[PDB]
From Swiss-Prot, chains A, B:
Source domain of life: Bacteria
Entry protein name: HTH-type transcriptional regulator QacR
The encoding gene: qacR
Record-level Gene Ontology MF annotations: DNA binding; DNA-binding transcription factor activity
Subunit organization: Homodimer. Binds cooperatively to DNA as a pair of dimers.
Statement: the UniProt record of this protein carries the keyword Transcription regulation: yes
Keywords: DNA-binding, Plasmid, Repressor, Transcription, Transcription regulation
DNA-binding region: 23-42
InterPro entries, per database record: DNA-bd_HTH_TetR-type_CS (IPR023772), Homeodomain-like_sf (IPR009057), HTH-type_Tx_Regulator (IPR050624), HTH_TetR (IPR001647), Tet_transcr_reg_TetR-rel_C_sf (IPR036271), Tscrpt_reg_QacR_C (IPR013571)
Residues of the HTH tetR-type domain: 1-60
The species this protein was found in: Staphylococcus aureus
Pfam families xrefs: TetR_C_5 (PF08360), TetR_N (PF00440)
Keyword Ribosomal protein: no
Amino acid sequence: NLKDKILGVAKELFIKNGYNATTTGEIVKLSESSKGNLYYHFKTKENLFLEILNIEESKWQEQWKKEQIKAKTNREKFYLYNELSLTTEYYYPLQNAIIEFYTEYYKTNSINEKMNKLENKYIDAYHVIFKEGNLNGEWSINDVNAVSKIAANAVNGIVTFTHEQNINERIKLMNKFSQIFLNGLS
Amino acid sequence: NLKDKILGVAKELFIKNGYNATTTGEIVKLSESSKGNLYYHFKTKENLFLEILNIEESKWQEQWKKEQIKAKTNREKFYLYNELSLTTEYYYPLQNAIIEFYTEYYKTNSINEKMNKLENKYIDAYHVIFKEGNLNGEWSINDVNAVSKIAANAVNGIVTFTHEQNINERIKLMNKFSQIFLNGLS
Ligand SMILES: CN(C)c1ccc(C(=C2C=CC(=[N+](C)C)C=C2)c2ccc(N(C)C)cc2)cc1
């Protein structure tokens, strides 16, 4: 495909180098195409990026759907989501580029739109887990939205700032985290 | 002093033009030093910047050393420290040079090592809190080391991925988080 050959290399570079680190010039080189093609489908580099992000938040979200089954209680779904967060190949792998990107476009008021569109998607899994666990008497969360936001970010933190120690260390920490958080809800 | 002069000049250069932009050429001239001297104290730009980072960490600990006197109990110090990490970052001038660096040196073990002894220092503040809260029946963590790494990363996660909310909300969320986390020990 066309837009699909591009997107692949982009995601490739965005992760491997960083937002700016990677440029349109580059993309073309290992993607073969007119420096224009990238203009209809995607409005700009902000687009090509935001697109890749959109896909990823979809893929990962879907994977989770095809795996939460293995968790009978939401308490379990919570521990499980955070754990998978460490192994997946989606979204998280370019949280660094996102950080770059947000600090380099945060000044334009077009950020609070898409960078708030992917927001509700990212914190959704926790929404469901907490909301649904409320209906299932697993706990009693009054401020579900707050807690989802907290959870989502704290975890993204554990996932990101430990990207160097061994994977089993990460999983144990992540698990101790999950343990404590839930124990704090009630 | 001449070495301290370079560290000082380099710091302001980094703040004004970021990490990649700043050249050792400029650093050498504005501090009235030389390539030779710059090479002797630090060996590289990476090395020089990491050195800045260490000095900054020290001032931060020093600051905290004073600021905590305000918080009587360790439950309090926990709350305070997290809020402080959130607010000081809102306006930390090196914050951007940091990101531009960390996202360019996370695949090199040279920098991933020294940047680890650096994070451990940040994790110590927590360690102290928790060890001390123990000796006061404020709580009883049998894995102070682990809980500490968790606290550090959960919090930084909340600090790093939330820039799209008004500072008040951020503060609300971090304090809520501190409540949940501290409660997560009952
Ligand atoms: C986006 N990005 C590349 C980042 C984002 C945040 C940081 C961290 C940080 C830097 C400066 C601070 N102040 C001047 C107050 C406070 C915190 C930090 C994170 C984790 C950590 N630990 C693992 C313990 C220690 C520090 C570093 C890189």
